[PDB]
């Protein structure tokens, strides 16, 4: 069996230029960032992950390699169960906080050692999960439109995804709601009806402008509703599933550990649990959150907004699981998703297909890494919540 | 009007002896330690805080310096309602997650705000919150008695605090409940019905074995049982109030903000809820919580244990506030309750008075500060809770 | 330490022209009445408040001078808190009734020793609670646009609020629904969609016409319906707020205490606690009734209507608390408005700025006060609500 | 007809001596006062009536004469329904607020109106409701065994009311739970089985102390305990009345109207409605709560403690309705029960019988009322309630 010998983070920064900067309710991106989780054993099998993004780099970093990382020195990689357990148990819960940026470092940390075990078993990560289940491959959508477009211009945006190949986009709403509806509205007439068009408020409204959005989405014909009040309302979130719209109530990549989701299933508050393997604790987490999902005639359909890393690791499981896709894959200015591996975007008819290597599948550009070390660039701009918070 | 100039994070650690370190189910205490916050403003007018532990130094130090630290600069201290909701929305949900270390740390800035304030009125903080309620002082418990005694240790180290003054104290339960109900059957035969005895099992048990202990509280007339089960199972708190007994459910020390507590008062999960002001947000999150917990008929007794500025902070609030005094006082060797500051213990007919002068109503000892940076000693052993998850 | 030498209650009249009285389903105004309180120390430091109306004025001097003031005097004003449930559990809970006139007496002496208490500290109100959360100002809306108008005159009144900088306004409605129905169409024709209309039937309905009534205030888009029905069937509100529309219910300004506003959160029945710290208990309670709407994620926009210091002691509290402002403004003809004090109506994009002096943050013109003293005069003629009983 | 020409309200005191003076969790008893209203007309036909106490006499005073009183001069006296719906909807609901004071005076004047209009009709009150149900008599008990009682001082009272004819008498209880248990255990030693033993607390504890008082009692074979726990807190009585002892959880003197008692059944909150004719709202409301009570299969049994006319006005209902009587006797020294009029205690095998003449039933001594107006003495020292909020 082996050893793990040292548990890495390699903080990396790539910039954006000003023109493609976008903002949403999680603010104006600055520069697309990552931790490259590094798990190296005494026999040089290593495993890669990735914590996904945006925390602090230097927050992740001391997580992984001094709070996390400690626990698993001398330890045989295999374990993964009880490892994840270990560090839970032993110090991320209590010491970092149970709903924390210590499960997303935990994440990056549980992915590597699934990449680890792939690599060491000479198998793609979805055969160990039980092979595919979508074995045509796996429906993406483009993400995202983002805020600061009049209507024509965000029906061009879906329209040139739509010419590229996907069958699915998503807008970000929440700032000027009367916008947000022209632009679904001009978007839907551009399209017709069989693409789908899913919105996301990056957490930006209140419940009673929640409810007035949900109208115009049902009228539009939307697929979900992401993000569309505070994680902390749950009730809030039970009031817009209870009208019994055919548009799906979404959230999740600000909800940690299968023990949120319960929460939510619990209080008849979620229709689509969008758990990021890179966030909500890992591959062995995400699992859980699926399966659970499942039991509760739910979806499961992950966040996967970060890097090339966190998008293989979901779209392993993704792949492994019996849920409709509905595949986030992120189309904005991002050397994270075309330089750092192998492993590109290739669409056909809609689809995208897993990686086929050995654990996560690919291989990564150690150049590129060495090239785009973090030097305290900031991630995002501040986020939104303020104006319905109630700030005028 | 004042500008906030620097906001600065001393990691400092005090070592604990080996035959005076305790356990819990939190783990086996190693080195006492704190963030010491100090908020610089341009007249020189400073406030300091603390964000409580064990959590990481270097985490608390670089969440606090560059993560909230930049979203102060510049702005007038005075607003502390507007900067909480402004670092809150604008980087800590987010950026360090919802329920979070990174709340943790907004919560040792804000205690910092609240000091600066109450120096710059020159008033002590519980005379801005409307001066006392408990006119008369504040009702202590000591704070605690550990795992690994005999009942008849046990039973003696109660007598002891009660022969100190203190009119209730805490038991540490949870490795091996046949002890701990031996532990608690001696020592109220040891001291008869008015002494409060409380017990806490720091999340260590499962929902059958917490229901077959809460009897055994029951039976001995036990006033609170303290994070009986994990946090993460509100089911399981609600199933043992639905139990009836006169014996309080409390939890609180390791859920952040009032969305957490009101989830747990939604669900009828709660009669002691415990938000620390220096952990579940700040004296501005924990005023908030002690009225929603006065609204629903159920009552606000923090923990404090850290250090001194987490007890006083919490003290000033608990003064001013209309719920039965159970006030936590570390008892436990911790240089941080004796060496930071000129305020100690000083118990009158079981009750102690918050600080009288401006702000938390002592200075601190800087040379004391400056003797004892971090560096880089662990706080706490590795917690426990992989038992009742199910580890042999 | 200071201590309280007499608590003093002077009753005030003011005159409306008849043309300039108004109606709603309160009754039709008389003459705009208040009590004046005057709380004095042994060194000279006096706070004032007023306990709202209309009540009865020789019933509020009573109680202030006779049954609260007695469990006063010989106290230091410093420990509101105390005092506060000092004289609930003494005397007015009992012996005035717990949601009565008395609470609002108590309301009037809890405003006036905080304002004694910024006096003491040389700081407005607003600071003691932790500063500003509302640092750009506070919107206002117009108070209001009562009955008896026709459909172009609810429209022209309408336009003449926002023509003096007001961006929201209220309409009372409840005798005749054709007519507040045509007259709110009329109105949101006329200001198009960005003017926030709120609607308050003071109580004049029944549910069956409170739900016709909902759905052409959802129609128009409007804010909030306050007080739809009696303030006792809280089942009547759940049943509004159950059909799920963006339309607010809101009541308060006849509920009292905290215990009132629970019962209507844990009923699922309420969006905006309208707790007026002039009647609900005294900023003490307002500010635990805001705390406790933010963790149920509602919100807290309280009545304010009878006085400049009932409107001042509110707008301390909004300014510092985190929920959107809808801060109620009254223009109609009151005296009590314009001449008691020196602070005035001024509106800048809508929004006004609590007053900046020392406590409430203004000086009285004593010699108005000594110029109307109450002759005997009513305040305002019997109130409605026999209709909706069921007299034709 | 009639027409009301004067409502008059004459406040009453007659003295305690120290000795005799109790005491209960409203307080110390130091002067039992009244108001006695009369309502005359122009023929000379005159009814009278009580709002009950301790209310403070001047705030009674002018709610009657001044609020109340000009709303029913003019008016025929024989439409009570409509008078009462007058006065609560043109002025008492808002103008005095809904559960106060104002509903007291309101009751005081239903009363009179009662009064009047059998005196109208040659007939005792109980033959316009429908003549008895109580054919034989009404069951009473002896009301109270008050605070500061050793065991064997508390076993010896409840057997001297046994040995004047009581079949039942009620204690006070919740200063010092040991000893009320002790007194409870001794007093049932003392009787047997076959006496009815009630505990009224007067709100003095919390739910945890009133869950192991509840255990106590069930234990003593106890009929009722009433108000067991603040008014306010309706969910405790839920969670009292869910432990399915035989014990009836009881409360209502301090509750006001059918709304009140209406949200107490709702969430399944009382087994004995103790609504008062001359506090809740007058012979008319009570007869609606009491019919209230009987739909639900519950029962009222009121309170009656104030003055002759408080009993005689709740005997007369009570010998009229189908609920098992437990007829509240105050047995104090209070000479309002004695010399203001004609009709005294008569038990004969444990029953009273309601007055036989006209109205009432009785007539007033008014030179006794002429030789005790009231000169501003208190009726009751400050009530507690304070204990149970938290000050040590
Ligand atoms: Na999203
Ligand atoms: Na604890
Ligand atoms: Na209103
Ligand atoms: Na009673």
Sequence with gaps: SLKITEVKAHALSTPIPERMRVESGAGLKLNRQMILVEVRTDEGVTGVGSPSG????????????????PQ???????????????VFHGEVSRNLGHRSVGIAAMSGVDIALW??????????????????????????????????????????????????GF???????????????????????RVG??????????????????????????????????????????????????QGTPVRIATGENLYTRNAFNDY????????????????????????????????????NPHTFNDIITVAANLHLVAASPHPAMFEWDITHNDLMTRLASYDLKLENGLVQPPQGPGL????????????????????????????????
Aim: net charge negative; hydrophobic share 45%.
């Design 54 to 69: 945006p925390y602090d780099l230097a927050v992740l970093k001391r997580a992984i390699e001094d709070v996390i990382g």
């Design 72 to 86: 698993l020195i001398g330890e045989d990689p295999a374990n993964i169960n009880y490892l994840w357990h270990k």
């Design 115 to 164: 990449d680890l075990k792939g690599r060491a078993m000479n198998q793609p990560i979805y055969q160990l999960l039980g092979g595919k289940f979508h074995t045509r491959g796996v429906r993406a959508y483009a993400s995202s439109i983002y805020w600061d477009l009049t209507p024509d211009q965000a029906a061009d945006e879906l329209a040139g995804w739509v010419e590229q």
């Design 167 to 189: 069958t699915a986009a998503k807008l970000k709403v929440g700032r000027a709601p009367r916008k947000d509806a022209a632009n679904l509205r001009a978007m839907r007439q």
């Design 193 to 242: 009806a069989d693409v789908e068009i899913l919105v996301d408020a990056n957490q930006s409204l209140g419940r009673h402008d929640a409810l007035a959005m949900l109208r115009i989405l049902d009228e539009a014909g939307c697929y979900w509703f992401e993000e569309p009040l505070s994680i902390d309302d749950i009730e809030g979130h039970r009031i817009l599933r209870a």
């Design 265 to 300: 299933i619990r209080n008849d508050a979620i229709d689509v649990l969008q758990a990021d393997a890179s966030r909500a604790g890992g591959i062995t987490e995400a699992l859980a959150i699926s399966a659970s999902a499942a039991s509760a005639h739910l979806a499961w």
């Design 361 to 392: 599948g690919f291989e990564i550009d150690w150049d590129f890494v060495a090239a785009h070390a973090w030097k305290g660039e900031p991630a995002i701009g501040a986020g939104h919540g303020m104006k319905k918070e109630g700030h005028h």
